[PDB]
Amino acid sequence: RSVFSERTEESSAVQYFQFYGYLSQQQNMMQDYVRTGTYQRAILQNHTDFKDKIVLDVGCGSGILSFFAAQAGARKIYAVEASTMAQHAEVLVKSNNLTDRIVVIPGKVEEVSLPEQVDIIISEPMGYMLFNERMLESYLHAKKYLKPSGNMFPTIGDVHLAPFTDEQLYMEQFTKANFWYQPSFHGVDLSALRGAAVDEYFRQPVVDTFDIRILMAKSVKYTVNFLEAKEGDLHRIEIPFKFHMLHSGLVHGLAFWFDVAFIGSIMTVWLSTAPTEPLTHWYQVRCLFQSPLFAKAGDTLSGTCLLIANKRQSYDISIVAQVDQTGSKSSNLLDLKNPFFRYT
Amino acid sequence: RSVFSERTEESSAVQYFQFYGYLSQQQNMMQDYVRTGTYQRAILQNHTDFKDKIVLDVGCGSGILSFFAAQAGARKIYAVEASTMAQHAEVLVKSNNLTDRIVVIPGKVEEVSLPEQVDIIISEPMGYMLFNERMLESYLHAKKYLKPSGNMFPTIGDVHLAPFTDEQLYMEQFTKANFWYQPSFHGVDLSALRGAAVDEYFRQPVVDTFDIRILMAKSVKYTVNFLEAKEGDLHRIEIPFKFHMLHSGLVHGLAFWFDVAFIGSIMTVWLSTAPTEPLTHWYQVRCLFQSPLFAKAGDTLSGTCLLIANKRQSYDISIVAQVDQTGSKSSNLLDLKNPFFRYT
Amino acid sequence: GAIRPAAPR
Amino acid sequence: AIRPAAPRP
Ligand SMILES: Nc1ncnc2c1ncn2[C@@H]1O[C@H](C[C@@H](N)CC[C@H](N)C(=O)O)[C@@H](O)[C@H]1O
Numbered sequence: 001r002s003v004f005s006e007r008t009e010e011s012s013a014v015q016y017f018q019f020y021g022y023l024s025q026q027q028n029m030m031q032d033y034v035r036t037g038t039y040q041r042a043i044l045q046n047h048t049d050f051k052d053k054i055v056l057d058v059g060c061g062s063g064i065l066s067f068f069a070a071q072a073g074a075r076k077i078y079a080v081e082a083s084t085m086a087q088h089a090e091v092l093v094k095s096n097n098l099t100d101r102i103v104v105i106p107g108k109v110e111e112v113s114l115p116e117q118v119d120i121i122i123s124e125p126m127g128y129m130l131f132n133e134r135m136l137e138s139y140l141h142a143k144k145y146l147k148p149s150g151n152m153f154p155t156i157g158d159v160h161l162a163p164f165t166d167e168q169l170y171m172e173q174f175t176k177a178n179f180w181y182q183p184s185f186h187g188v189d190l191s192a193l194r195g196a197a198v199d200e201y202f203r204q205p206v207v208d209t210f211d212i213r214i215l216m217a218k219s220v221k222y223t224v225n226f227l228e229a230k231e232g233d234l235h236r237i238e239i240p241f242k243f244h245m246l247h248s249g250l251v252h253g254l255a256f257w258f259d260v261a262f263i264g265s266i267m268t269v270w271l272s273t274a275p276t277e278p279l280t281h282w283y284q285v286r287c288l289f290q291s292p293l294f295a296k297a298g299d300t301l302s303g304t305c306l307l308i309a310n311k312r313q314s315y316d317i318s319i320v321a322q323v324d325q326t327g328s329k330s331s332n333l334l335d336l337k338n339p340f341f342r343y344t
Numbered sequence: 345r346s347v348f349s350e351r352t353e354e355s356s357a358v359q360y361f362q363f364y365g366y367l368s369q370q371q372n373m374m375q376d377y378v379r380t381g382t383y384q385r386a387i388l389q390n391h392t393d394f395k396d397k398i399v400l401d402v403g404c405g406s407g408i409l410s411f412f413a414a415q416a417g418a419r420k421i422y423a424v425e426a427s428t429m430a431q432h433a434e435v436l437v438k439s440n441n442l443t444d445r446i447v448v449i450p451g452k453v454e455e456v457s458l459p460e461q462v463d464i465i466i467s468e469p470m471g472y473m474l475f476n477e478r479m480l481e482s483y484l485h486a487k488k489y490l491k492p493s494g495n496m497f498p499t500i501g502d503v504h505l506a507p508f509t510d511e512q513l514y515m516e517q518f519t520k521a522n523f524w525y526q527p528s529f530h531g532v533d534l535s536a537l538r539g540a541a542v543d544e545y546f547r548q549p550v551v552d553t554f555d556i557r558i559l560m561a562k563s564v565k566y567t568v569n570f571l572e573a574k575e576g577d578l579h580r581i582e583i584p585f586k587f588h589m590l591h592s593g594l595v596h597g598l599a600f601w602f603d604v605a606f607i608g609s610i611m612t613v614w615l616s617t618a619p620t621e622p623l624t625h626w627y628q629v630r631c632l633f634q635s636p637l638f639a640k641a642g643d644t645l646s647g648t649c650l651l652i653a654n655k656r657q658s659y660d661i662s663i664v665a666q667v668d669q670t671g672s673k674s675s676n677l678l679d680l681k682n683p684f685f686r687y688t
Numbered sequence: 689g690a691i692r693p694a695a696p697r
Numbered sequence: 698a699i700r701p702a703a704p705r706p
């Protein structure tokens with residue numbers, strides 16, 4: 001029926017809103033001080049973008065950003081939440097005496113009906129690697145409620161990618177896969193599945209953090225402007241790159257992170273997940289190459305990162321990279337929904 | 345409409361079989377050497393239950409248990425697997441030159457056709473706390489293919505329950521929940537959700553191991569005989585208990601583990617997950633009592649553990665307990681499907 | 689369910 | 698979560 005049900009398998013949706021129905025998982029995000037405090041500073045320092053304005057909070061979870069919008073003097077805030085967390089948000093709105101200002105509206109933002117158009121939309125719709133969950137598309141879908149010349153918080157998003165070297169990591173994954181090389185596991189030959197195993201293990205994006213010295217070139221930026229993008233712009237995301245290699249070594253894959261900017265009338269406030277910044281619950285993401293590329297300082301590593309949306313609220317990622325000076329090419333798939341959470 | 349489809353929400357099924365479709369998840373089980381090595385020994389040491397026999401492998405996964413049936417001399421093995429792992433099991437059957445003796449049948453054991461009756465059914469259908477996943481019911485369902493006087497491997501399963509004291513584990517719960525007892529979390533009073541948070545954390549069974557010294561009375565045992573049991577017998581599982589307390593202290597909940605036995609013609613071999621035995625990928629499971637009970641050595645802690653099967657391939661657990669000498673009472677509800685993995 | 693990673697603490 | 702991770706030797 002809805003734009004959401006059309007693009008989403010039910011099995012994905014149930015599991016997804018299940019996860020966000022746990023107070024523990026809302027608390028997980030809330031306790032990211034860099035996340036939650038940057039959102040509050042973006043909202044409070046741009047008070048005039050909220051004062052006496054009508055606001056839509058897309059996926060309000062606990063209500064936390066709706067509270068900041070209220071703290072900033074919003075006249076009315078529509079807080080939309082599709083999980084059962086909606087019920088807990090209404091309890092907090094009553095207990096904080098904000099029944100006059102915050103109106104929880106349970107359901108998917110694609111399916112609910114709002115009483116009026118809004119001056120500004122706030123959300124925190126960023127998955128790991130920015131695009132996981134496809135919630136950016138719910139955020140963009142919500143502009144059907146936005147007044148002309150209305151604002152988005154966050155306003156833009158920058159994906160950064162850079163090449164890295166990490167033989168320890170590479171070897172970690174390679175070794176897991178090599179279980180399936182054994183010709184006599186309890187007397188059974190598994191070796192026929194070695195190829196399928198390496199494929200599966202290297203499909204997995206690695207979520208953790210790293211020292212910036214592992215980066216072999218300055219990062220490439222790809223920007224999504226939320227005021228101007230439409231939903232369909234996120235169906236197929238093509239990110240071409242050309243890297244000027246600053247260090248010689250093996251390139252074991254690409255590292256990804258993202259920043260979002262809240263472009264307000266008073267000031268712009270950045271929320272960064274970069275490895276040069278304080279760590280967030282998004283960490284950073286690395287896509288490993290099954291076959292590493294050797295490159296020399298001054299070479300160019302060029303190619304395309306292609307993200308193709310799927311029905312499981314995520315993306316089919318293909319990364320094709322080549323060292324221009326040798327025609328050494330690496331083609332890679334990555335199943336963004338099946339990550340290896342490596343952080344400790 | 346199959347027996348499986350009718351008991352199982354599609355959204356649980358999809359996710360469930362997605363999990364087992366990963367080589368890394370098959371690998372996780374295979375690498376439990378206690379599990380895999382005991383299965384091998386049970387089968388190989390009872391070679392006369394397999395020599396020239398017809399075998400069904402319920403949920404074959406990679407194929408491992410069917411390869412052991414072959415090592416033991418089976419004439420024909422039907423290896424049923426409902427996940428996409430089925431394709432990979434076929435690859436191994438071919439590469440191990442066993443197509444004449446092992447036939448992979450992709451699908452649910454509740455939905456496939458077998459061409460003939462079998463002498464013995466082998467399976468590994470034990471979830472944590474034994475009953476999680478409701479795969480025991482698939483294993484029982486398969487008896488429709490068993491010849492009269494056919495055997496089951498495993499043959500019986502015993503769940504053990506015992507009271508424990510672990511003050512530090514208990515207090516972990518309130519620490520986590522007390523996040524919500526903040527009057528000014530970025531200016532928001534969260535306190536109204538503190539009781540809901542407590543209840544959510546206490547609804548989680550705790551998967552990890554422990555020192556046997558925490559145990560306060562000898563265990564009570566609830567046995568399922570797989571030769572005799574019907575599927576329906578696992579929809580409502582009532583485990584009465586009267587513990588004669590050997591140690592005085594605060595009882596913080598009940599600890600669970602399980603054993604299975606392969607009763608072969610030559611010998612009975614046991615696979616135990618007890619906290620006195622080497623650790624398995626099942627660990628042990630603790631259900632906390634949100635109001636703990638004081639008992640002295642000599643007292644009787646009586647009550648019932650009631651596991652009620654649900655359509656998410658798991659159980660709603662109700663635990664009710666009292667110290668008979670004082671009348672003090674504790675009532676607890678847990679969601680077996682959503683544990684805390686505390687070993688990690 | 690493989691959605692948001694744990695906040696670092 | 699379905700099966701827990703096997704104990705690391
Ligand atoms: N289409 C949708 N409609 C309504 N809510 C959604 C939708 N997609 C995701 N959500 C919710 O959006 C929230 C995403 C969270 N990252 C944000 C929670 C909260 N706003 C916070 O910043 O703490 C979750 O609570 C989801 O359940």
Ligand SMILES: Nc1ncnc2c1ncn2[C@@H]1O[C@H](C[C@@H](N)CC[C@H](N)C(=O)O)[C@@H](O)[C@H]1O
Nearest residue numbers: 364373403404405425426427451452453468482
């Ligand atoms: N109803 C069902 N029909 C067929 N296969 C099932 C069913 N339920 C669970 N399974 C499979 O049973 C397997 C359970 C595993 N613990 C056993 C795998 C393998 N036999 C081993 O011992 O390593 C998974 O591969 C599931 O996909």
